[PDB]
Design a protein around this ligand. Structure first.
Ligand SMILES: [Mg+2]
Ligand SMILES: [Mg+2]
Ligand SMILES: [Mg+2]
Ligand SMILES: [Mg+2]
Ligand SMILES: [Mg+2]
Ligand SMILES: [Zn+2]
Lengths: 87, 50, 132, 38, 217
RNA sequence: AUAUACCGCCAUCUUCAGCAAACCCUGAUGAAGGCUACAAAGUAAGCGCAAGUACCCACGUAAAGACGUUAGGUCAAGGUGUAGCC
């Protein structure tokens, strides 16, 4: 939920010198236009939807003997020894 | 600064008051909070106003 | 089974700090009161306003310094003066910090008619007391 | 007061200084209700 | 590359000349040949049992001499290769002597309660990097309870070789060098600890001599 | 509207002492089990009992009491999923 909301972002589209702009160079309290906020808002909704469709991305699970059954599922090559002995 | 003082400690007061543990029934199960106040008396004898 | 400030022991991957590893039967024993004001002593007035004011600061500070508080806060009061001890992770840029410092310093002072002084302390990670 | 305590935080969310998580959660779940229902 | 002396006694036979340390006359007065009652006899020890006189096993000492001559060769080689020789017993009669015979040489003993998973779970019982022992001498392969010792299973498990004084009661099948005979007489274990000290104390000084010579060359 | 979606707070067995991650072993490598100090396979961080702490002490009384059971109690402390009305 709290991943794309940067701490510069506001619904009332405003700008600050310390954050949300490239730092200290413009050093005045500016706001966006309503017609500039209309693009950043729909862009953020689009990127949320991008992250949602990446969440709804079907993984290619290999098939051991069946679907929905741990048949010939190959797990990883096993864990090392804590002093060597890679496998 | 040269002031003839004396220090003693008056008795301490605890105000222990009670309230319900649950939100509903089980009135027979309370929980009690106490507030301590510790005093210190700091007499200062024979000094100028300033 | 009382459930007040207990974090419930579940699995060995729960890292907790010192203040929340302890149940509320330890507050004078192994902990300390995080807010420090004179309102609770007896007899003395004006208790309620300062507790509501203090619960406002903890909701305010956990939002405006987002995702970077390690612990809860400490509020100290010395008369017409109140200071805030806060431990903050070293994740955000110090420029971004120093903006939100003075913004808080003047906004909360103009809100509560009192010269506040928020004094932070950096930490790399959240300090772990008990791996439950 | 509870009006100055509320309108200040609402306008500070709008300006972008206060990040109220409960209002972050609530209207997003309202959007998820309005995507299907409503 | 010092790998000449790592293989030079391997080409020899009786490199340390250990056959001078004992004789079958030296075992007979040590009363190695005595055994338990014939009803108290393990089935797998009848290869080494000579016969039975008056319901008493006598161990075939010309077959024990062959076993012990190779067992002493094995422990002398394992002590010349600067390895770890561990002395396991559970008899409680000679546990003072056995810790003495480990402390006289530079090796280790264990004559008390064998904690469970001492050799198999060493990575967790001790720190996670431990040189596990690589030769185990069983002086009494039974417990105080007349059952085979758990370490003769666990050292066979951990792929480390065991020599051991097998008696007429006890299982020889995991003992990689069984040394048949008595173990329950004090003269037996006094000859055994002296023999197992003398076969390894020769080996340590023979390690020192040949390595000092191949520093001289 | 649902405490049979929940958080939050507690009741209870609790006038209990256990619960247990990560290993190791035995059961022909089955569900499982792991006890014998003149000791035969158990080792165990962590939590709890315990110890400390409060009141008048070292005692007592409080406090504490895990993991679980009873889908125990509460959408009416507050918030909140879902369903509903506008
Ligand atoms: Mg299928
Ligand atoms: Mg209770
Ligand atoms: Mg009680
Ligand atoms: Mg206790
Ligand atoms: Mg019910
Ligand atoms: Zn014997």
């Amino acid at each position: 939920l709290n991943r794309g909301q940067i701490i510069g972002e506001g619904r009332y589209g405003f700008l600050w010198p310390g954050l949300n702009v490239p730092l200290m160079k413009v050093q005045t309290i500016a706001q966006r236009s309503k017609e500039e906020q209309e693009k950043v808002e729909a862009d953020m909704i689009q990127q949320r939807e991008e992250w949602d469709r990446k969440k709804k991305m079907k993984v290619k699970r290999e098939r051991g003997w069946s679907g929905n059954s741990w048949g010939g599922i190959s797990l990883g090559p096993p864990d090392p020894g804590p002093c060597g002995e890679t496998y | 600064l040269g002031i003839s003082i004396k220090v003693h400690e008056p008795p301490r007061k605890i105000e222990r008051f009670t309230l319900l543990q649950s939100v509903h029934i089980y009135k027979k199960h309370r929980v009690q909070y106490e507030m301590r106040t510790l005093y210190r008396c700091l007499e200062l004898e024979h000094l100028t106003g300033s | 089974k009382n459930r007040a400030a207990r974090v419930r022991v579940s699995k060995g991957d729960k890292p907790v700090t010192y203040e929340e590893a302890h149940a509320p039967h330890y507050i004078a024993h192994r902990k300390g009161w995080l807010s420090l004001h004179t309102g609770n002593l007896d007899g003395e007035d004006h208790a309620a306003e300062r507790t509501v004011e203090d619960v406002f600061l903890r909701k305010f500070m956990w939002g405006t310094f987002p995702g970077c508080l390690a612990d809860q806060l400490v509020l100290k009061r010395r008369g017409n003066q109140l200071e805030i001890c806060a431990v903050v992770l070293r994740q955000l840029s110090p420029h971004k910090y120093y903006f939100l410092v003075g913004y808080s310093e003047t906004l909360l002072s103009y809100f509560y008619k009192c010269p506040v002084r928020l004094h932070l302390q950096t930490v790399p990670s959240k300090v772990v007391y008990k791996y439950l | 007061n509870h009006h100055t305590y509320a309108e200040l935080m609402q306008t500070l969310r709008f300006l972008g200084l206060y990040r109220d998580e409960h209002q972050d959660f609530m209207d997003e779940q309202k959007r998820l209700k309005k995507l299907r229902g409503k | 590359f010092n790998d000449k002396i790592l293989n030079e006694p391997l080409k020899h036979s009786d490199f340390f000349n250990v056959k001078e340390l004992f004789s079958v006359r030296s075992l007979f007065d040590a009363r190695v040949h005595l055994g338990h009652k014939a009803g108290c006899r393990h089935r797998f020890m009848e290869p080494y049992i000579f016969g039975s006189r008056l319901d008493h096993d006598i161990i075939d000492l010309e077959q024990t001499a062959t076993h012990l001559q190779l067992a002493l060769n094995f422990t002398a080689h394992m002590a010349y290769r600067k390895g770890i020789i561990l002395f396991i017993s559970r008899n409680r009669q000679f546990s003072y002597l056995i810790e003495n015979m480990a402390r006289d040489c530079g090796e280790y003993a264990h004559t008390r309660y064998f904690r469970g998973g001492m050799l198999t779970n060493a990575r967790l019982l001790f720190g996670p990097t431990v040189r596990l022992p690589d030769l185990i001498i069983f002086l009494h392969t039974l417990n105080n309870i007349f059952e085979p010792h758990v370490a003769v299973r666990d050292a066979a498990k951990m792929n480390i070789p065991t020599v051991g004084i097998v008696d007429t009661n006890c299982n020889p099948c995991l003992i990689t060098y069984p040394v048949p005979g008595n173990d329950d007489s004090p003269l037996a274990v006094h000859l055994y600890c002296r023999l197992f000290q003398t076969a390894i104390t020769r080996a340590k000084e023979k390690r020192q001599q040949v390595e000092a010579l191949y520093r001289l060359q």
